[PDB]
Design a protein around this ligand. Structure first.
Ligand SMILES: CCCCCCCCCCCCCCCC(=O)O
Length: 470
């Protein structure tokens, strides 16, 4: 694409008369005459009287907005389809946008997933951190330091305003999920006068401490695990047993044997038709994936029943869904993009004592996710080694002129807990719409109570009353 040139739309190669095109944006907005990024867009034209475009972001970070728009199209309320062009976009560095963040080969990822990743002795910590340093080196080798430095949400928000103008909208109508609510609040702060409407489903509090938010997310997934297990306990054949007070214990009786009990570095994978088998780390990841929605609880139950017989096929497939590894062993770039974006969106945690204390607390908060006992050591995260500095700093959202917005928060959301949505709505001086459930996000996913509130807000600007629940 040509910087400043309008989007050339062409039929995508797909539901509707979907149109696809690219938009050029500067890599560095302070160097407009420099390197350029090409953002991939998809557009489903409105069927009635068009108000404008409804631009979505599915979250992640690292998740394709084009893929999400294709999914949302199938569950879009008729009224929204009539009045809005549904538009998805791949953020800079993500999926079909170019250049795309790449760090790991398919083999790099496969080799890491084969490891139990439970050894937190000094030797185990050293091994993890060495792997992490080699990962970062690969990101730098394949991507520019310059491109890595500018993939953050602060620049995504600027890209979003360019997208708004390229779509012909005077003002933005935006729906953001999870991480996408950070795009939303960043956009709201820099372009408050351009915001027509914003729905933010699954909230990120930009003023949160990174460690406490991580521990609240650990608690969220343990809460979800507990709700899954109490449900399972009522059902015949529950692989975690009929006593939910012992479900964590029984769970570990199923996954812990995937680790050599005398050498925590040795995997004893459960048998699968796939040549990989099921490692302990993939078992945990596959469990986390299933706790995103009750619609995946049946799959977790199938996966744990398989583990009773030392089989791991379903948990492996759940982990592959989390990692976005397709049936040919190919990963999309969501994993690498997620890290690179997260590491520039706030100052990383580099203090060893804080990281060690975090692991001590996480083991108690989310025992389903921890193997063995606290060792007194824990590895630094990937961002502690990141080679370019943060481009955003934690702070409370301040956008006093912003139109009323709607934050949707699910009471037992494991990934973006409920209270984070309460806090974000407070900072935005917006409306809080509550959904009672144990899932991450809910908008345009089959609930007419939620969707009716959202439709009325998008079309007529009507916000839900204080205390609205679905
Ligand atoms: C999304 C896949 C890539 C993960 C980031 C690359 C760093 C690989 C080395 C870390 C090994 C994983 C063990 C530590 C993970 C954690 O701290 O929770």
């Amino acid at each position: 694409p040509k910087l400043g040139q309008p989007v050339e739309w062409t039929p995508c190669r797909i539901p509707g008369g979907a149109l696809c095109g690219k938009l050029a944006v500067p890599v560095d907005y302070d160097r407009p005459d420099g390197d350029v990024a090409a953002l991939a867009l998809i557009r489903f034209p409105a069927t009635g009287d068009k108000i404008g475009s409804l631009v979505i972001n599915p979250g992640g970070p690292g998740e394709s907005g084009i893929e999400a728009a294709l999914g949302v199209f199938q569950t879009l309320p008729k009224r929204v389809h009539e009045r809005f062009d549904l538009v998805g976009f791949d953020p800079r560095g993500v999926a079909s946008s170019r250049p795309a963040i790449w760090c790991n080969s398919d083999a790099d990822n496969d080799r890491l997933r084969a490891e139990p990743q439970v050894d937190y002795s000094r030797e185990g910590v050293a091994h993890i951190e060495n792997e992490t340093k080699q990962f970062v080196g690969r990101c730098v080798d394949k991507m520019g330091k310059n491109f890595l430095a500018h993939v953050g949400t602060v620049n995504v928000a600027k890209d979003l305003d360019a997208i708004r103008a390229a779509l012909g909208d005077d003002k933005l109508t935006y729906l953001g999920y999870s991480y996408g609510t950070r795009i939303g609040s960043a956009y709201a702060e820099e372009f408050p006068q351009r915001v027509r409407a914003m729905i933010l489903d699954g909230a990120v509090d930009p003023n949160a401490d990174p460690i406490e938010a991580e521990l609240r997310q650990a608690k969220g997934f343990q809460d979800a695990f507990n709700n899954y297990a109490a449900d399972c306990a009522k059902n015949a054949g529950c692989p975690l047993g009929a006593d939910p007070a012992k479900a964590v214990e029984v769970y570990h009786s199923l996954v812990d044997p995937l680790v050599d009990p005398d050498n925590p570095r040795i995997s004893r994978p459960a048998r699968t038709k796939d040549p990989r088998g099921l490692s302990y780390s993939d078992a945990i990841v596959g469990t986390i994936m299933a706790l995103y929605s009750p619609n995946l609880w049946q799959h977790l139950t199938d996966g744990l029943s398989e583990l009773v017989d030392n089989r791991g096929d379903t948990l492996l497939a759940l982990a592959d869904m989390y990692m976005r590894r397709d049936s040919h062993g190919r990963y999309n770039n969501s994993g690498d993009a997620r890290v690179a974006i997260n590491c520039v969106d706030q100052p990383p945690v580099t203090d060893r004592d804080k990281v060690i204390d975090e692991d001590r607390r996480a083991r108690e908060i989310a025992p389903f996710m921890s193997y063995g006992k606290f060792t007194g050591d824990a590895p630094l995260g990937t961002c502690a080694f990141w080679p370019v500095p943060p481009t955003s700093q934690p702070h409370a959202v301040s956008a006093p002129g912003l139109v009323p917005t709607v934050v949707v928060s699910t009471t037992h959301d494991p990934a973006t807990p409920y209270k984070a949505g309460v806090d974000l709505a407070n900072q935005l001086r917006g409306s809080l719409l509550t959904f009672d459930g144990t899932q991450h996000t809910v908008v345009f996913q089959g609930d007419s109570c939620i969707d009716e509130y959202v439709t009325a807000y998008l079309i007529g600007g009507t916000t839900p009353p204080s205390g609205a629940k679905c």
